[PDB]
Design a protein around this motif. Structure first.
Motif, PDB file in Angstrom:
ATOM      1  N   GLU A 284       0.994  -1.304   0.126  1.00 54.68           N
ATOM      2  CA  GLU A 284       0.031  -0.056  -0.016  1.00 54.68           C
ATOM      3  C   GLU A 284       0.868   1.241  -0.164  1.00 54.68           C
ATOM      4  OE1 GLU A 284      -0.042  -2.478   2.343  1.00 54.68           O
ATOM      5  OE2 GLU A 284       0.308  -1.401   4.454  1.00 54.68           O
ATOM      6  N   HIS A 317      -8.654  -4.325  -0.356  1.00 52.85           N
ATOM      7  CA  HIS A 317      -7.885  -3.990   0.939  1.00 52.85           C
ATOM      8  C   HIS A 317      -6.780  -2.985   0.800  1.00 52.85           C
ATOM      9  CE1 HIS A 317      -5.449  -6.535   4.095  1.00 52.85           C
ATOM     10  NE2 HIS A 317      -4.481  -5.722   3.317  1.00 52.85           N
ATOM     11  N   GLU A 318      -6.069  -2.928  -0.336  1.00 56.81           N
ATOM     12  CA  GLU A 318      -4.998  -1.920  -0.559  1.00 56.81           C
ATOM     13  C   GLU A 318      -5.527  -0.654  -0.347  1.00 56.81           C
ATOM     14  OE1 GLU A 318      -1.733  -2.526  -0.784  1.00 56.81           O
ATOM     15  OE2 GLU A 318      -2.437  -4.698  -0.073  1.00 56.81           O
ATOM     16  N   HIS A 321      -6.235   0.463   3.155  1.00 62.90           N
ATOM     17  CA  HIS A 321      -4.910   0.820   3.946  1.00 62.90           C
ATOM     18  C   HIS A 321      -4.474   2.298   3.706  1.00 62.90           C
ATOM     19  CE1 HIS A 321      -3.074  -2.661   5.796  1.00 62.90           C
ATOM     20  NE2 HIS A 321      -3.105  -3.104   5.010  1.00 62.90           N
ATOM     21  N   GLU A 340      -3.399  -4.127   9.538  1.00 67.38           N
ATOM     22  CA  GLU A 340      -3.541  -5.218   8.614  1.00 67.38           C
ATOM     23  C   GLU A 340      -5.335  -5.718   8.906  1.00 67.38           C
ATOM     24  OE1 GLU A 340      -2.141  -5.984   6.104  1.00 67.38           O
ATOM     25  OE2 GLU A 340      -0.202  -4.990   6.447  1.00 67.38           O
ATOM     26  N   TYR A 402      -4.297 -10.579  10.989  1.00 65.28           N
ATOM     27  CA  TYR A 402      -5.220 -10.105   9.834  1.00 65.28           C
ATOM     28  C   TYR A 402      -6.821 -10.669  10.329  1.00 65.28           C
ATOM     29  CZ  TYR A 402      -1.498  -8.925   6.856  1.00 65.28           C
ATOM     30  OH  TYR A 402      -0.486  -8.527   6.086  1.00 65.28           O
TER      31      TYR A 402
HETATM   32 ZN   LIG Z   1      -2.324  -5.352   4.214  1.00 68.31          ZN
END
Ligand SMILES: [Zn+2]
Ligand SMILES: COc1ccc(C[C@@H](C(=O)NO)n2cc(CNS(=O)(=O)c3ccc(-c4ccccn4)s3)nn2)cc1
Ligand code: NA
Length: 896
Positions: A284, A317-318, A321, A340, A402
């Motif tokens: 990221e 997800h990215e 972030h 995370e 996670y």
């Molecule tokens: Zn990550």
């Protein structure tokens, strides 16, 4: 205490001193893609808080030539400045700059350094990557990857996430290359020799591990969000057509994240680049998010629906972030989950909000079940555990930080409501913007959240205390609790326990593993009569409740939103199973999935016998909800493959017969196409893969026919993506098809098709063919080394390749440590994927001796204990439940 040139190092702690605080980096990088090396220079603006005779920063594998100190506030260091003495301490990856005179507090100084190194050849720091063009040309690019402690391999810096600062990056390049970095490009100046120099906008305050700069020749597609952010998807030129969906999804997802978080993305541009050689799934870097080709590129001709889901997941997800990670960063790696875990959880919210058609809400339960697999063991850990050495920091990136963090966040949302949870998130992000936070800060901001003197104020303060107290026990304690429920007319006795896999209720060490563990569990339950959800917080070891209704069954943990397992004593399990067999539609679908999961977990836990679970799997003939059907089938398929990995042919053949017979109507009604919804297509893929794995004659004939037609047409005929992996695997059973698939792999332009082809080749029976695949992966020319960790796993799970992969790993350990780090995810996945499936005393002894051999050499990893305990778990499960499975299968044969 020592150094490379003798003398003493003025520092011992592997943590940098808090005296010298960085403010602004001026980083100039000159990479040469022909000699495969780079020269660079930097000027770090530093603030001195206390008088010191030395500055300590991080540096690794960098030859430093010049080092000076200037100052505009201290006249003693006026222009042009004085020279500094450089001491190197590789043990802590630090260097010491010795100053001639003590620095003055509350002043500002400038540290200039000139350094040089080669472009790395691995997956860390500033390393070199290659890709292949459509015509067969090979091109080279240079890319950075710094998380967690690899920024020090590219430029000397205070390489800890707390030392945030600004970054002004300048890159020198040739005319055939473009240069990308975190911030947009402000200006390009032409040099005398004919080279070019790109100047980038100054970055905002951010940690070192997010700095990125790439020199390549990629092509991009650009678009704009609602808030004017320029999103650009970069990839190799011949692959530009594969970037369309990646742009569409990123735009939508960015808009949602802005609306949900109520905070605009602060940079004017956001770039998503697909790196050919990339170890992690993605990274990221602020404004320049690097991806694996399989995580970003989408080709409709060769990408299945699951591929679409994974690409959307990784982009969500990215992008998440950018707030949970870049904007608000953790204080130290011990609280890595603050980044995370949230990102993993935000996948569910974002994807489900923007692409509800992908139905990721149903899939989320697997995220929690995967950690429950590892949390029911003694070798687990709390979500917040300290770490120091780089290997330990790398180990922090495990399923705990996670998935478990994501699951308890989902549990807390269900307890607090979406509005209250969203408001707490927004307050947390706005409060700690451009700085760092820790675990206590998050829970304070989440508990003290305002929706939209009085007794309402007193209850508000009491409930915010309650919430914070609740989550502290979930983050600081390992394991997962088990809720034992006993019914009694109207009384309900609730007991809490530490759930343990393969340690029964009377085992001699079970009471030594029940020490101090107690959880504030937010229990939710519904009844057969009233659909109203009831909520109660269990704060003690034992409790009792009352519901004036006297009903048949009680289903605890609605939709499995809570991180705990429920167990029903007496007739509770029998009532539920009878309910399912008669009318499963009276229970919620997620309740059914949770029931199946919990039943099989308790069978392993010794609170239930395996015939109970197998009798529950009878109702699967009446199940239409795809998640529950795939859950039960996965358990039965795991049983078959567990038997097939051993020489137990009778139980394996009986399991094959039962699966092909009891599930024949659902298998026969499946088409060989890409039609239907996402779960419809995924159900088709799983069912056809299962049928073809069991040598079902219609599946094999259809797959062989499709593969023959495809090979005779030479790519001109189209195979549906949902069946692509199945067809290729069947085709690989012949030496002609195997070689043809390997040739098409080398020539393919779709990373997804390559991944399917590689799996297909790994399903071969010839030892030499599998060994050649492993050797090709090791060489890294035809099959990229980034795929090795995955390839070995696919080979080891199958009977023919189990011993081969295990032998390879034991013999070539030193060669593997040259390609990856010890704590790297690849080495961890290689060890687990080649050892964890073992289920015999002989293999457990072999693995134990191998791990001991790895000891005393300097290599220690927590995965060693986790694998050993899992193998032990498997051995216990076999001895305790093997004849039961045999008997049940034989009883089914006779029951008709
Ligand atoms: Zn990550
Ligand atoms: C869902 O899409 C995902 C899921 C994970 C990632 C990982 C990624 C990240 O999440 N960054 O924020 N990352 C971590 C690190 C540094 N640590 S590492 O040891 O080298 C390591 C590498 C990969 C790991 C991993 C992979 C899968 C599951 C558990 N762990 S762990 N670098 N990049 C990316 C996208
Ligand atoms: Na992160």
């Amino acid at each position: 205490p020592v150094a490379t040139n003798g003398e003493r190092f003025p520092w011992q702690e592997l943590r940098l001193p808090s005296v010298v605080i960085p403010l602004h980096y001026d980083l100039f990088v000159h990479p040469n893609l022909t000699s495969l090396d780079f020269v660079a220079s930097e000027k770090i603006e530093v603030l001195v808080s206390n008088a010191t005779q030395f500055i300590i920063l991080h540096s690794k594998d960098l030859e430093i030539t010049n080092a000076t100190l200037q100052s505009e506030e201290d006249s003693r260091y006026m222009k042009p400045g004085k020279e500094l003495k450089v001491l190197s301490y590789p043990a802590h990856e630090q260097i010491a700059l010795l100053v001639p005179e003590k620095l003055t507090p509350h002043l500002k100084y400038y540290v200039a350094m000139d350094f040089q190194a080669k472009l790395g050849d691995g997956f860390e720091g500033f390393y070199k990557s290659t890709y292949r063009t459509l015509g067969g040309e090979t091109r080279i690019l240079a890319v950075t990857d710094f998380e967690p402690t690899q920024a020090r391999m590219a430029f000397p810096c205070f390489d800890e996430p707390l030392f945030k600062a600004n970054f002004s990056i300048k890159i020198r390049r040739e005319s055939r290359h473009i240069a990308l970095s975190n911030m947009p490009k402000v200006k390009t100046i032409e040099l005398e020799g004919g080279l070019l120099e790109d100047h980038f906008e100054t970055t905002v305050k951010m940690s070192t591990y997010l700095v990125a700069y790439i020199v390549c020749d990629f092509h991009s597609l650009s678009g704009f969000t609602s808030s004017g952010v320029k999103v650009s998807i970069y990839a190799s030129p011949d692959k530009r057509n594969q970037t369309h969906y990646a742009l569409q999804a990123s735009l939508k997802l960015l808009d949602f994240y802005e609306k949900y978080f109520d905070i605009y993305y602060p940079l004017s541009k956001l770039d998503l680049i697909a790196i050919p050689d990339f170890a992690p799934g993605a990274m990221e870097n602020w404004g320049l998010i690097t991806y694996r080709e399989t995580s970003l590129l989408f080709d409709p001709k060769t990408s299945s629906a699951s591929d679409k889901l994974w690409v959307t997941r990784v982009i969500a997800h990215e992008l998440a972030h950018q707030w949970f990670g870049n904007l608000v960063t953790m204080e130290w790696w011990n609280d890595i989950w603050l980044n995370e875990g949230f990102a993993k959880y935000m996948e569910l919210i974002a994807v489900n909000a923007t692409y509800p058609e992908l139905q990721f809400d149903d899939y989320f339960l697997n995220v929690c079940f995967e950690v429950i697999t590892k949390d029911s063991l003694n070798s687990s850990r709390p979500i917040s555990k300290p770490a120091e050495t780089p290997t330990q920091i790398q180990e922090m990136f495990d399923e705990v930080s996670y998935n478990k963090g994501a699951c308890i966040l989902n549990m807390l949302k269900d307890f607090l409501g979406e509005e209250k949870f969203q408001k707490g998130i927004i307050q947390y992000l706005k409060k700690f913007s451009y700085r760092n936070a820790k675990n206590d800060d998050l829970w304070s901001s989440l508990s003290n959240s305002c929706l939209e003197m009085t007794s309402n104020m007193l209850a508000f303060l009491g409930e915010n205390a309650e919430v914070k107290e609740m989550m502290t026990t979930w983050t600081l304690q390992k394991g997962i609790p088990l809720l034992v429920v006993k019914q009694d007319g109207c009384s309900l006795r609730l007991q809490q326990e530490r759930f343990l896999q393969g340690v029964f209720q009377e085992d001699p060490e079970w009471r030594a593993l029940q020490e101090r563990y107690l959880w504030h569990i937010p229990l939710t339950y519904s009844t057969s009569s009233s659909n109203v959800i009831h909520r109660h917080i269990l704060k003690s070891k034992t409790d009792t409740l009352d519901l004036p209704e006297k009903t048949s069954w009680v289903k605890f943990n609605v939709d499995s939103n809570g991180y705990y397992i429920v167990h029903y004593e007496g007739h509770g399990w029998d009532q539920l199973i009878t309910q399912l067999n008669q009318n499963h539609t009276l229970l919620r679908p997620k309740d059914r999935v949770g029931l199946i999961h919990d039943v099989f977990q308790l069978v392993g836990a010794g609170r239930l016998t395996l015939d109970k679970a197998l009798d529950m799997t009878y109702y699967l003939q009446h199940e239409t909800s795809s998640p529950a059907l795939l859950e039960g089938l996965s358990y039965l398929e795991s049983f078959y493959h567990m038997m097939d990995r051993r020489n137990i042919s009778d139980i394996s053949e009986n399991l094959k017969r039962y699966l092909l017979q009891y599930f024949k109507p659902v298998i026969d009604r499946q088409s060989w196409s890409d039609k239907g919804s996402v779960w419809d297509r995924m159900l088709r893929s799983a069912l056809l893969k299962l049928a073809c794995d069991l040598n079902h004659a219609p599946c094999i004939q259809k797959a062989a026919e499709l593969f023959s037609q495809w090979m005779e047409s030479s790519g001109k005929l189209n195979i549906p993506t949902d069946v692509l992996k199945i067809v290729y695997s069947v085709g690989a059973q012949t030496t002609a098809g195997w070689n043809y698939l390997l040739e098409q792999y080398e020539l393919s332009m779709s990373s997804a098709e390559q991944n399917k082809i590689l799996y297909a080749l790994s399903t071969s029976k010839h030892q030499e063919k599998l060994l050649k695949l492993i050797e090709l992966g090791m060489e890294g020319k035809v099959i990229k080394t980034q795929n090795l960790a995955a390839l070995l796993h696919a080979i080891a799970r199958r009977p023919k390749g189990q011993q081969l992969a295990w032998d390879f790993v034991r013999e070539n350990w030193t060669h593997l440590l040259k390609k990856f780090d010890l704590g790297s995810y690849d080495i961890r996945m290689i060890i687990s994927g080649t050892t964890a499936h073992f289920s015999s005393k002989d293999k457990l002894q072999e693995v134990k001796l191998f791990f001991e051999s790895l000891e005393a050499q300097g290599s220690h990893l927590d995965i060693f204990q986790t694998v050993l305990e899992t193998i032990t778990k498997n051995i216990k499960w076999l001895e305790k439940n093997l004849p039961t499975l045999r008997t049940w299968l034989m009883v089914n044969t006779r029951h008709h």
